[PDB]
Design a binder for these strands. Structure first.
Ligand SMILES: [Zn+2]
Ligand SMILES: [Zn+2]
Lengths: 177, 279
RNA sequence: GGCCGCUUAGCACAGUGGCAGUGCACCACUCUCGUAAAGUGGGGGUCGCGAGUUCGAUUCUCGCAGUGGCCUC
């Protein structure tokens, strides 16, 4: 066996950003699927109920309501995975490339592989700056592929600032037309 | 003893260039426009100033990073109505942006078009004493009581400078990292990949603190932090803004302020912040 | 009283006989982890002030107005 991208998992990941977009949180969604479930046999879209029930943990960018400015999607679902119960060998599929924070946390937990659809230059852990295989020990590392469904991953994120903020200082907020 | 942490850089070198001598001012005033029209400065060669006076007398530089153009020099001679002699000079190939002392260090040969770099404030005399008091009061005593052999020994504190450097929140015993676990120990202690991880660690003693002040994001506070934050706590300090970071004993195995990569200096990131060592 | 320095846009500070500048900013604009950030461009000035010198003075020359350091009372 091995791990390959499965379409329905990324569909769930991207449809897990629209719900957070309606809430008004930044549209970044992560889906932790079972380690031995990303196998080619599950590549097809068949058995949608079974495929979306094999999903182990899902998270969104819960920073707006929480108040913790340091809690992206990756840091939430792992908590959910911890709450439902380990060395996080489960594969993680996210819509935007993990930030340096998430790329460090996943390194510390020995993640088997972390796929992402879009690359965010301002805060990118596997893009501009590379924590994919940076740590040198003595054998601690993970991998990450280029991008899948990037167009949706950027449309949802652009639809965020087109609508304005709410909590903001009257002087510091932007009254864009 | 505060040692400011700055991105290392190499001293500039010199590449050949061609100059000349100018006697009268009006000819040079016309020559400025003539050279601007004929030989505009290259983008890599725009970091210099054409105006120059000889040490002994005015001598003017003409061509940067290479020989003069034949037609351009002939037109310059025609404008001067006299022959133009060329003496070789040298011009810098590396542009400094952080040190005023380094900026002046090569000013003897030639000035820089980019002005004196904005010198960061060199703290103050009393704030050093405040830092010493906080070290002898809070962070260092925790690193004393936090570690028996079992807990790691890292403590971080969110100090507020406006109120006389008072501790807003301090990480305690129930926040630190176990030695046996290897998930938390990759960043701070060496060879943590040898042992398996019993648990999953999501928060280090620098992220527990930053999530207890929400009661914007810690913008404008300060963080005394004993051992130097890892790469995760670097984004803790960069998404949740922080004015200054004071690490005492650096982490060679992995660290976002020291060994691995100086996160605070990364250009694409929004919030650039300063880091001071304090041993 | 004396002596030394200093005055430049809303602000903070360069700079020099011939173009009047640079950081913060009243503001505007562009984007992929709120766009409450960061990059980017525009406008903003009696260079105490007067007299003199110079084809030409913020600069040079003198005086005067102001502040600051030391000294004298
Ligand atoms: Zn992240
Ligand atoms: Zn850390």
């Amino acid at each position: 066996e091995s791990v390959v991208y499965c379409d329905v998992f990324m569909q769930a990941a991207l449809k897990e950003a629209t719900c957070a977009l309606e809430e008004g949180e930044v549209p970044v969604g992560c889906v932790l699927v079972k380690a031995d479930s990303s196998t080619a046999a599950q590549a097809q879209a068949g058995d949608d109920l079974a495929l979306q029930k094999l999903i182990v943990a899902r998270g969104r960018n819960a920073t707006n309501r929480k108040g913790h400015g340091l809690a992206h999607a990756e840091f939430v679902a792992v908590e959910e995975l911890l709450r439902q119960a380990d060395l996080a060998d489960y594969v993680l599929y996210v819509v935007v490339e993990p930030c340096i924070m998430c790329a460090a946390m996943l390194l510390y937990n020995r993640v088997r592989k972390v796929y992402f659809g879009c690359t965010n230059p301002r805060f990118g852990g596997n893009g501009t700056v590379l924590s994919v295989h940076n740590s040198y020990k003595g054998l601690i590392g993970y991998e990450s592929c280029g991008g899948y469904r990037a167009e949706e991953a950027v449309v949802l994120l652009q639809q965020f600032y087109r609508r304005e903020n709410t909590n903001a200082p009257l002087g510091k907020r932007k009254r864009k037309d | 003893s505060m040692e400011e942490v700055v991105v290392p850089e190499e001293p500039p070198k010199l590449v050949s260039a061609l100059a000349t001598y100018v006697q009268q001012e009006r000819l040079c005033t016309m020559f400025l426009s003539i050279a601007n029209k004929l030989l505009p400065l290259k983008p890599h060669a725009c970091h210099l100033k054409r105006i120059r006076r000889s040490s002994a007398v005015l001598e003017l530089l003409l061509s940067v990073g290479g020989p003069v153009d034949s037609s351009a020099l002939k037109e310059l001679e025609s404008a001067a109505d006299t022959t133009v002699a060329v003496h070789r000079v040298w011009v810098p190939d590396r542009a400094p942006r952080s040190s005023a002392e380094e900026w002046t260090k090569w000013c003897q040969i030639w000035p820089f078009a980019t002005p004196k770099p904005r010198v960061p404030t060199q703290l103050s005399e009393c704030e050093v004493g405040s830092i010493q008091r906080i070290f002898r009061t809070v962070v260092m005593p925790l690193a004393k009581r936090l570690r028996t052999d079992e807990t790691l020994g890292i403590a971080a504190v969110l100090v507020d400078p406006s109120d006389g450097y008072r501790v807003l929140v301090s990480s305690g015993e129930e926040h630190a990292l176990k030695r046996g676990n290897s998930a938390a120990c990759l960043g701070y202690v060496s060879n943590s990949g040898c042992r398996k991880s019993n648990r999953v660690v999501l928060d280090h003693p620098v992220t527990f603190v930053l999530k207890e002040v929400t009661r914007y994001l810690a913008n404008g506070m300060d963080m005394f932090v004993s051992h130097e934050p890892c790469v995760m706590c670097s984004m803790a300090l960069v998404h949740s803004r922080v004015r200054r970071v004071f690490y005492c004993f650096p982490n060679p195995v992995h660290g976002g302020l020291g060994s691995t990569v100086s996160i605070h200096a990364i250009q694409e990131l929004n919030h650039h912040f300063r880091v001071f060592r304090c041993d």
